[PDB]
Design a protein around this ligand. Structure first.
Ligand code: STD
Ligand code: APC
Ligand code: MG
Ligand code: MG
Ligand code: ZN
Ligand code: ZN
Lengths: 105, 729, 95, 594, 283, 112
DNA sequence: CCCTGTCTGGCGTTCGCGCGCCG
RNA sequence: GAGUCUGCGGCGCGCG
DNA sequence: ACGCCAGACAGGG
């Protein structure tokens, strides 16, 4: 439902040391399929931070108690050197399709 | 002659670079002289495309050049022709002048050839603009390639051999209107120049010499060539095209990769993989829906929006300037004198809007304060200020606002203050302020899309994936095109692409069918045959056979004459599949659609959304200084023209007041429109028409000239149009 | 389409006259007060945010609804031009 | 099966039988089911769906070989360079038409439910010539100039239209592209010129009492030299539909009363009667013979308002007319200019604008008989009597069909082809010209699919003859061209009210729509098109008081329109409530003093 | 007739031929001025030439230039064409030009070309829509029926006054959902007109019942797609609004779509099933 | 308050030229840069044509609507807005006559 | 001096909308 | 108790 | 470039 890169301000920016652009990344996040186990989890914010010459996959997200990620190997990004990526990606339970413009989190 | 480069998309730019215009110095060709010039003359062969001309009053007058056409020494479009001495074809070429070409007997490239040997006694050749069946012994020269007969822009049409010249024109033109999508896919079926286009055009970034990759940033790919050298290759991250299309180079090479000379390091604004890509491949059922596709309407599946398939970034550069008035310089500050802080949030940086801020229509993009009157204060506004707070900022609110229509998010901002670096500030202009905004254009009902052949149309309804036509296997179609728009226009090429497209889907492969030499009906029947096993083969093994549905459509199909009666449904569906059509279920009912419906991968692009698309509706607004007719521009849309043609329409009808209204209350009656507004504000009945300014201005203009125009009464006596300003003193 | 436009068409000598009537009627419907109607009781004009059209939505929508009935009268010269506006103000209150 | 015509007709009927709005419901009903059934029908174009006929290969080959014979026939010296060409063209022109009915014959017999075919047969989409280019073959496409190529285009769109056959086809597309766009502005212009003269015409009346009607003809003279024939059902319907009988006519049994507006069903009766042979003409009020100087009445115009009942007074028929003529043009003026059957917009311009046509035909100024001579240089067709002959020089290029022997009435074709209005007027009179223009105008429109009511052409043509010359003065000197009715004014009061019969002898003048608009009474309307420079010069010199009548002029002022609600007939109409009718009577009762 | 001669040249008003501030200090004045100066200079220079001493050659030569000048403002081009100095070899728009032709002044009046309450967007079929109505964007409606809405806002609690109601809508993020209810109420029974690209016949314009919808596109009924020659490959139609109760009257009684089913050309209908419907009803 | 029923074009009498005329433009003085105000009597002077200001006058002796129809004792300024400026006409007294090209070059010379 | 013919001189040639540029 | 001033002529292109 | 109308002048009795 939402994402926050630490040094990024808008959706059309590019992060150094990171091949992909914020837009391509946010796109690949739509591809992320998470599975929570109970109503108590209405909105869960997944946190992830990786640095340097490493590939950022979806299993790199620090695990949360009642939530599970069935899309581990999904490719988030390719970090070069001095590649600093610290983001917070929101996740919610809903129905149908909701334009990013309709909710505006 | 020199104009704005049209860079909707790279191919557009490119085309606008080479098109030959007639109008110009004036010495050459004028505007209303042309029925002989506008025609496509014989010699236009390989020199000038006979298709690339515009639709409209200025037609046949402007045209892009051909494939290999090259201007030699003096402005003569010569065309490549290969030599053939005796019954022997050479790989030698001679760019020949328009004149010399008449001296020889040239033949077509489709001529059967074993290498250097002509293969058929009676083979086609064309003397001088005259079709002639010559012998292998007279063939003095042969054409290089069918492509040379046309332009680059046209060459890009899949099966151009099966489309009518008129709708083909619309084709080639539409491509020049293609807008770069963040997501760029190459056609499932190509012609052979998609690659060449992004290459000779400067879309993608190629590797100079062989080497390896060092760093792969989202901003730079520093490659290390094997010669001991390394170059940093910045990439135009997100730049503003003239026409507001995004131009970004997306790296396609991973870290540390030995690159071959001339391989894509990054993809241009619209390339997938070194291939020209605009709009995207999409599965399409070619059937009729309710009325959603009546004459030229298009039904889209909401599914295309789920996955950003038709999404385009649009950057607009609004700009504001701090002018120096003799009343007091117009300052740029966060202070918007009269009413709220809620409108000042996004204006975080004192005056300028904060980057990454969502700006909706009517929000302050930049703030500015000028002075209230022309030279004097206000006697009535003086008491108002004093009552609530005399101490009020005399400055007027003239702040760049988001014009009606749409704004997106603020991506970049530019401010040029007093001590200018190496900038050229116009006189009076104290300082300027640029505000780039971008927005995601999710394909909506208002947009228009069209395929390379000529099928144009607007989206009438975004259907939920829930009930649109679905294939035996859960795979649902994305767009549903109306069949009726294909017979009238003549372009079977679209129906041929769909079929080839069908095979490519289940066979998982793209193709490249040349201009006149491309794919043939048999060959496509072949691939389709290969597709039936991918489609129905897996179905056999996955565990299930044919439906009651699939069988009923077969009955109605054999009663039709699409399948030979007496063969097994397995064998019949194949025959039917080879026909390019399969069975489809309604999706809304689950029942089949009586009769096989073709389906396939058709390449469809989105056309550029001009400020003409983004609707213009006006209530009240500015007015012209000399004529008193309504006009807009910046933020007030500006009124629509009512033309004589339309006047007559009302004239026909008994719409007297409606017409009167149009000529008075709505446009020229200065006193009428004022009282009109006010009356409506109160819920009153508009006053009766005063004379229109156009009339008054007419009279005085006529008066500027000797002539005396005086209105008269029942008995020939005066009456006064100018209410009381013509009497003297 | 609209209510008995045919019926209405047949009630006049000329198409364009019906328009005049309906318009002038809708005019006086608002001006001298909107209750200047001849058929409000049992079945009358209605909108649905509530049944609130009884008071002031569309003027001529009523006019036609009236003319469709046989209560009103439209002549080339039925009642002296000035004395009508006078007698009308005297008998209809709302302002 | 329900075709666009069967349904067209159902609407029409529904309109007349049950009522307007009720019909509207019907429209939507069709609209909904036709849309739904369509989806389910699963009709879709498959490249295949375009079905090529098996006979295509035969007819092509049969015509192929025949081409050889013509070639061998020329390689010997038998056929002149020309004969060869005209002969080849003929071959394909027929062969192509053969493939045509062939393709359809295939669908008709083998594939009644073919997506493409079904769309073409149902009033949906598709044309016979178009289908031909997909399954059959688009065979002949002219060169740049106009001479059609000797080589046809053997391919279809189904199969690869080759490299060169495309280029050769481009010439025609560019020309079409250029011609089509030229027809568009030439059509709007014509509508500006059509409006420029008929704008003032508006229905404002009382049954005009001048019963001088127009007689609508049901039979036409020369298709084949001389054979009487029933005109087409369409053309005849165009002329008598919703008209008003100028006089009573008893035909097959029923009694067609006077003034009665004939319905389409009546117009059907008359034809059937004509079939039996009871009526050759039809008395009908027409704008061609109305008395109302500026404007036309209810009985002479007819039925057609947008509604099916008599025309409602105050309807801008002038424009209504002018429009019905300018729209079909844009559609048929493109083909008619393009071609044997029909010459178009250029002719429609030569028509509304009185002028001397391309191939002129010497008309017979005298009505006696025709005869012809033999001498070498120039032929000669003479209309003679034992008293005098009207010598008609017919150079080498003209062909004459009237023969040594019989009668030739005034203005009759003595040469073959087109005729000059001015001459026919002089020879056969005005009544004839009007009638000629009208039908000669419809010829073009009929031959291209458009079905416009004669009414409209009449309205305009009238204005073409709204003027006349003078040869016996009274108030103002002889050579002068003035408004015909304004002379009917002078003449009427100089003989009836004030004595001294000073006959104002005039001469009918035929003027082109353009000329009439150019030179009209008011100047305001003239200040619009021709020369604002001239128009005003004269209008000034002579203090001209533009009486405001007519919509053009009255529009510039921004004043209400003289027609419509501004229609003097309904500008004034008051509404009453029985409550206010008694209150007004109460005001009359208070008038009794003491 | 003694007036045909000019001894007094009328000058056109000051504002009409605009002396305006352009940019940075650039000034734009109507061409007529340049011609007027010509005349003024000539006449003056003549007077002085006669008063100084008058050598025959030079008095005529001037009166000549004078004569031509006088032609210039009246009509340019009838004899030679005056030009603004090296910049644009363009005919200074003389009085004659201003009055004649295509986009002249006699044509600006006649065709009256710019409506205050107008709109124009792309059209899109609206299959469920009835001939009676049309789909008009609410966003479009808002501006179109702004004044009509402002008042309606005050009749309810959405806004205190007009000016209040105005600022309330100046920004898009400020619109209370209550406003749409107001507008939806304002257009209750009013109707607007729709215009097609070339207005060829009276049906080139028709009146429909606006049914406010979301988005940019304007929903047009399919049956009327034949009246206006309009397909949906992107054709755009304009839209107007009848302001007086009279204008609305005529517009919904005689100009509405549904009431004009038959064509003025022929007694044939123009609401016949089209390309799609016939295909369905045939099969 | 009457209805305009007839319009009429008529030639111009030199006296009528002057009669529609307010003031006489006797000098080629457009507007002098320092002050974007009309220079002298020239083409844009406000007397000859009209109030450069709303309801206010020249010097400001009378400045609102109460006395809308009177002229300033020390300065001649009657006022409404500046529309009077766009409706007023001026005349140029030509030395030696010249003729209308409209009457002279029309195909039929109305004068010839 | 008359009538006839020939080059000659003036006007017109859809509508609306977008965008962008320029003194 | 709100209202001024700018956007013109032309050119190019593109849509229906 | 064209087409079209309307025109004013010059040549052959
Ligand atoms: C009334 N007119 C007619 O129909 C007939 C009579 C006559 C005529 O008057 C013609 C023309 O006036 C043609 C004008 C041209 C070529 C206009 C261009 C400038 C057009 O080009 C484009 C660029 O712009 C506009 C419109 C469309 C265009 C093509 O895209 C524009 C108008 C014409 O074609 N005729 C034929 C000729 C051959 C021969 O001599 C024959 C006897 O008569
Ligand atoms: N120059 C122009 N002037 C006026 N209208 C134009 C135009 N160009 C296009 N159009 C309008 O838009 C339409 C475009 O023409 P087309 O659709 O090609 C004609 P068509 O013969 O109907 O082809 P089609 O039936 O195969 O669709 C016309 O009906 C016309 O009204
Ligand atoms: Mg279209
Ligand atoms: Mg079309
Ligand atoms: Zn009559
Ligand atoms: Zn003063």
């Amino acid at each position: 439902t939402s994402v926050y890169i630490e040094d990024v301000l808008h959706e059309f920016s590019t992060i150094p040391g990171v091949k992909e652009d914020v837009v391509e990344i946010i796109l690949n996040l739509k591809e992320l399929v998470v599975r929570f186990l109970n109503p108590s989890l209405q909105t869960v914010t997944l946190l992830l931070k990786a640095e340097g010459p490493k590939e950022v996959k979806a299993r790199d997200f620090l695990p949360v108690a009642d939530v599970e990620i069935m899309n581990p190997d999904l490719h988030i990004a390719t970090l070069e050197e001095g590649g600093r990526l610290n983001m917070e990606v929101r996740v919610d339970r809903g129905v149908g399709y909701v334009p990013a413009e309709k909710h505006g989190i | 002659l020199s104009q704005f480069k049209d860079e909707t998309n790279p191919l557009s730019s490119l085309r606008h670079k080479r098109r030959i215009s007639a109008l110009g110095p004036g010495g050459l060709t004028r505007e209303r002289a042309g029925f002989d010039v506008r025609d496509v003359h014989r010699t236009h062969y390989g020199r000038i495309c006979p298709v690339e001309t515009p639709e409209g009053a200025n037609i046949g007058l402007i045209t892009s050049l051909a494939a290999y056409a090259r201007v030699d020494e003096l402005g003569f479009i010569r065309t490549p022709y290969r030599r053939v001495v005796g019954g022997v074809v050479t790989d030698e070429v001679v760019y020949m002048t328009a004149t010399e070409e008449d001296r020889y007997t040239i033949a077509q490239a489709n001529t059967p050839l074993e290498g250097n040997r002509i293969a058929a006694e009676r083979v086609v050749a064309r003397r001088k603009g005259e079709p002639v069946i010559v012998s292998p012994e007279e063939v003095e020269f042969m054409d290089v390639s069918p492509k040379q007969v046309f332009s680059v822009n046209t060459n890009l049409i899949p099966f151009l051999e099966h489309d009518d010249a008129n709708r083909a024109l619309m084709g080639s033109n539409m491509q020049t209107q293609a807008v770069p999508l963040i997501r760029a896919q190459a056609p499932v079926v190509m012609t052979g120049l998609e690659e060449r286009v992004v290459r000779d055009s400067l879309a993608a970034l190629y590797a100079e010499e062989d080497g390896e990759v060092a760093k792969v940033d989202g901003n730079r790919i520093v490659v290390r060539y094997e010669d001991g050298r390394l170059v940093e290759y910045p990439l135009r991250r997100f730049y503003r095209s003239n026409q507001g299309t995004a131009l970004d180079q997306r790296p396609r090479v991973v870290v540390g990769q030995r690159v071959r000379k001339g391989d894509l390091l990054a993809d241009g604004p619209a390339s997938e993989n070194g291939f020209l890509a605009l709009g995207q491949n999409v599965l399409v059922a070619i059937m009729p829906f309710d009325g959603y596709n009546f004459e030229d309407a298009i039904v889209i599946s909401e599914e295309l929006l789920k996955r950003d398939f038709y999404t385009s970034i649009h950057i607009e550069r609004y700009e504001i300037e701090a002018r120096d008035t003799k009343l007091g310089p117009e300052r740029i500050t966060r202070d918007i004198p009269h009413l709220s802080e809620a409108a000042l949030r996004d204006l975080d940086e004192e005056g300028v809007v904060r980057i990454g801020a969502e700006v909706k229509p009517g929000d302050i993009l930049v703030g500015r304060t000028s002075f209230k009157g022309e030279s004097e204060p206000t006697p009535e506004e003086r008491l108002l200020r004093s009552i609530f707070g005399e101490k009020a900022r005399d400055v007027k609110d003239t702040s760049l606002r988001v014009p009606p229509g749409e704004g997106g998010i603020v991506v970049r901002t530019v401010r040029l203050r007093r001590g200018d670096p190496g900038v050229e500030l116009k006189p009076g202009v104290r300082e300027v302020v640029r505000v780039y905004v971008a927005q995601k254009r999710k394909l909506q009902v208002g947009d228009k899309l069209a395929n390379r052949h000529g099928n144009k149309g607007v989206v009438a309804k975004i259907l939920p994936v829930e009930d649109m036509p679905h294939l035996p296997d859960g795979t649902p179609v994305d767009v549903i095109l109306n069949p009726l728009g294909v017979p009238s226009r003549m372009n079977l090429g679209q129906i041929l692409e769909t079929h080839l497209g069908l095979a490519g889907y289940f066979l998982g492969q793209r193709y490249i069918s040349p201009i006149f030499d491309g794919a043939k009906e048999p060959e496509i029947k072949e691939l389709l045959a290969q597709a039936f096993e991918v489609y129905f083969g897996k179905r056999k093994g996955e565990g299930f056979g044919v439906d009651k549905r699939e069988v009923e459509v077969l009955r109605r199909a054999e009663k039709l004459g699409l399948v030979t009666p007496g063969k097994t449904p397995e064998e019949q569906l194949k025959e039917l599949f080879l026909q390019g059509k399969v069975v489809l279920y309604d999706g809304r009912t689950g029942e089949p659609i009586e009769g096989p419906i073709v389906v396939g991968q058709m390449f469809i692009m989105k056309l550029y959304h001009m400020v003409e698309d983004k609707m213009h509706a006006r209530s009240t607004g500015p007015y012209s200084l000399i004529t008193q007719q309504p006009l807009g521009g910046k933020a007030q849309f500006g009124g629509q023209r009512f033309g004589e043609m339309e006047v007559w329409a009302l004239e026909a009808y008994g719409a007297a007041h409606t017409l009167q209204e149009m000529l008075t209350l709505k446009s020229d009656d200065i006193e009428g429109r004022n009282a009109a507004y006010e009356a409506i504000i109160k819920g009153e009945d508009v006053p009766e028409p005063s004379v229109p300014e156009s009339f008054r201005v007419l009279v005085k203009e006529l008066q500027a000239l000797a002539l005396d125009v005086q209105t008269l009464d029942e008995k020939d006596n005066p009456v006064d149009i100018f209410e009381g300003l013509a009497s003297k003193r | 389409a609209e209510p008995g436009i045919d019926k209405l068409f047949g009630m006049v000598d000329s198409k364009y006259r019906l328009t005049v009537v309906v318009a002038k009627r809708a005019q006086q419907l608002l001006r001298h007060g909107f209750k200047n109607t001849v058929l409000e009781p049992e079945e009358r004009p209605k909108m649905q945010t509530l049944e609130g059209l009884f008071d002031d939505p569309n003027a001529v929508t009523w006019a036609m609804k009236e003319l469709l009935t046989g209560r009103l009268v439209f002549g080339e010269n039925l009642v002296p031009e000035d004395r009508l506006q006078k007698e009308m103000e005297r008998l209809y209150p709302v302002e | 099966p329900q075709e666009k015509n069967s349904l067209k007709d159902l609407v029409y009927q529904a309109f007349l039988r049950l009522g307007m709005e009720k019909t509207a419901r019907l429209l939507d009903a069709l609209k909904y089911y036709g849309f739904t059934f369509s989806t389910t029908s699963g009709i879709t174009i498959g490249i295949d769906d375009a079905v090529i006929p098996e006979e295509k290969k035969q007819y092509l080959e049969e015509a192929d070989r025949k081409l050889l014979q013509i070639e061998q026939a020329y390689e010997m010296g038998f056929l002149t360079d020309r004969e060869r060409y005209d002969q080849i063209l003929q071959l394909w022109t027929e062969t192509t038409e053969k493939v045509t009915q062939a393709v359809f014959k295939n669908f008709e017999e083998n594939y009644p439910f073919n997506p493409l075919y079904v769309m073409a047969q149902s009033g949906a989409r598709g044309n016979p010539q178009q289908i031909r280019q997909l399954c059959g073959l688009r065979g002949l496409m002219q060169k740049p100039s106009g001479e059609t190529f000797e080589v046809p285009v053997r391919s279809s769109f189904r199969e690869g239209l080759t490299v060169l056959e495309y280029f050769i086809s481009s010439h025609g597309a560019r020309k079409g592209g250029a011609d089509t766009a030229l027809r568009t502005a030439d059509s709007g212009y014509l509508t500006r010129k059509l409006v420029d003269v008929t704008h003032e015409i508006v229905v404002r009346e009382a049954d005009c009492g001048t019963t001088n009607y127009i007689s609508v003809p049901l039979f036409q003279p020369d298709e084949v030299t001389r054979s009487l024939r029933l005109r087409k059902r369409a053309d005849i319907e165009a002329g008598l539909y919703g008209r008003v009988l100028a006089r009573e006519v008893e035909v097959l049994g029923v009694r067609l009363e006077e003034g009665r507006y004939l319905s389409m069903d009546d117009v059907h009766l008359l034809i059937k009667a004509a079939e039996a042979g009871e009526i050759q003409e039809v008395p009908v009020r027409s704008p061609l013979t109305c008395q109302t100087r500026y404007g036309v009445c209810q009985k002479c115009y007819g039925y057609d308002l947008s509604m099916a009942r008599p025309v409602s007074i105050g309807e801008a028929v002038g424009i209504v007319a002018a429009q019905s003529i300018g729209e079909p043009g844009t559609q048929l003026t493109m083909r008619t200019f393009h071609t044997d059957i029909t010459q178009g917009l250029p002719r429609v311009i030569e028509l509304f604008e009185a002028r001397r046509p391309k191939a002129k035909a010497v008309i017979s100024e005298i009505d006696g008989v025709v005869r012809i001579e033999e001498t070498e240089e120039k032929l000669s067709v003479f209309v003679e009597s034992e008293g005098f002959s009207k010598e008609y020089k017919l150079p080498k290029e003209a062909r004459l069909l009237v023969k040594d022997g019989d009668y030739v009435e005034a203005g009759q074709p003595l040469t073959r082809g087109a005729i000059d209005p001015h001459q026919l007027l002089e020879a056969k009179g005005p009544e004839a010209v009007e009638r000629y223009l009208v039908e000669e105008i419809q010829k073009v429109y009929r031959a291209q699919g458009v079905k416009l009511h004669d009414k409209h052409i009449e309205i305009v043509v009238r204005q073409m003859m709204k003027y006349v010359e003078v040869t016996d003065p009274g108030d103002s000197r002889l050579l002068e061209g003035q408004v015909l009715e304004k002379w009917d004014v002078e003449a009427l009061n100089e003989r009836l009210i004030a004595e001294g019969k000073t006959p104002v002898a005039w001469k009918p003048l035929l003027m082109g729509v353009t000329k009439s608009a150019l030179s009209t009474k008011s100047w305001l309307s003239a200040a619009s098109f021709q020369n604002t420079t001239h128009v005003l010069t004269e209008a000034a010199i002579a203090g001209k008081k533009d009486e405001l009548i007519g919509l053009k002029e009255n529009v510039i002022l921004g004043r209400l329109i003289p027609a419509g609600t501004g229609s003097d007939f309904v500008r004034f109409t008051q509404v009453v409530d029985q409550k206010t009718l008694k209150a007004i009577e109460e005001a009359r009762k208070e008038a009794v003093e003491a | 007739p003694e007036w045909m001669i000019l001894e007094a040249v009328p000058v056109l008003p000051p504002d009409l031929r605009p002396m305006v501030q352009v940019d940075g200090g650039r000034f734009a004045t109507s061409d007529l001025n340049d011609l007027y100066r010509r005349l003024i200079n000539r006449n003056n220079r003549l007077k002085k030439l006669l008063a100084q001493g008058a050598p025959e050659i030079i008095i005529r030569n001037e009166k000549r230039m004078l004569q031509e000048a006088v032609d210039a403002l009246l009509d340019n081009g009838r004899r030679g064409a005056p030009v603004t100095n090296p910049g644009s070899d363009r005919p200074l728009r003389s009085l004659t030009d201003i009055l004649s032709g295509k986009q002249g002044r006699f044509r600006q009046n006649l065709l009256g070309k710019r409506v205050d309450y107008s709109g124009r967007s792309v059209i899109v079929v609206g299959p469920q829509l009835k001939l009676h109505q049309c789909g008009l964007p609410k966003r479009m409606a808002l501006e179109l029926f702004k004044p009509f809405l402002l008042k309606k806002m005050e009749e309810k609690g959405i806004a205190p006054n007009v000016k209040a109601a105005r600022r309330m809508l100046e920004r898009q993020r400020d619109i209370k959902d209550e406003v749409w209810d107001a507008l939806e109420e304002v257009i209750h029974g009013k109707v607007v007109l729709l215009n097609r690209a070339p207005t060829l016949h009276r049906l080139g314009i028709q009146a429909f019942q606006p049914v406010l919808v979301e988005g940019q596109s304007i929903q047009l009924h399919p049956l009327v797609c034949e009246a206006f020659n309009a397909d949906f490959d992107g054709d755009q139609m304009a839209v107007h609004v009848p302001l007086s109760s009279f204008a609305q009257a005529e517009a919904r009684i005689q100009m509405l779509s549904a009431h004009n089913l038959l064509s003025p050309a022929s007694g044939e209908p123009l609401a016949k099933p089209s390309r799609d419907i016939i295909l369905g009803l045939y099969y | 308050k009457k209805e305009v029923r007839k319009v009429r074009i008529a030639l111009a009498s030199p006296e009528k030229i002057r009669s529609w005329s307010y003031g006489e433009v006797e000098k080629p003085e457009t507007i002098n840069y320092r002050t974007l105000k009309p220079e002298r009597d020239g083409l844009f002077d406000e007397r000859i044509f009209g109030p450069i200001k709303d309801y206010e006058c020249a010097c400001g002796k009378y400045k609102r609507q109460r006395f809308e129809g009177k002229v300033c004792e020390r300065c001649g300024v009657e006022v409404t807005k500046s529309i009077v400026r766009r409706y007023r006409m001026g005349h140029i007294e030509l030395a030696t006559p010249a003729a209308h090209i409209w009457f002279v070059k029309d195909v039929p010379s109305k004068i010839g």
